[PDB]
Amino acid sequence: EETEEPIRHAKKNPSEGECKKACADAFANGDQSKIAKAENFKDYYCNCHIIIH
Numbered sequence: 001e002e003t004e005e006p007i008r009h010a011k012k013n014p015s016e017g018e019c020k021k022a023c024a025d026a027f028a029n030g031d032q033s034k035i036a037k038a039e040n041f042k043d044y045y046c047n048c049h050i051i052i053h
Helices: 016-028
Strands: 002-008 035-042 045-051
Touching (some): 002 016, 016 045
Antiparallel strands (some): 035 045
């Protein structure tokens, strides 16, 4: 079960990889195993898919 969370990324249109890294940094301090995927939500926003369990 994942939860969506649009975070603020420092890039107008970050690539999903950039987003995943940011979602990782901001949520797991860099760990990308807590993040299923991330994708551009809007300008400077990435929708993080946070894996709860």
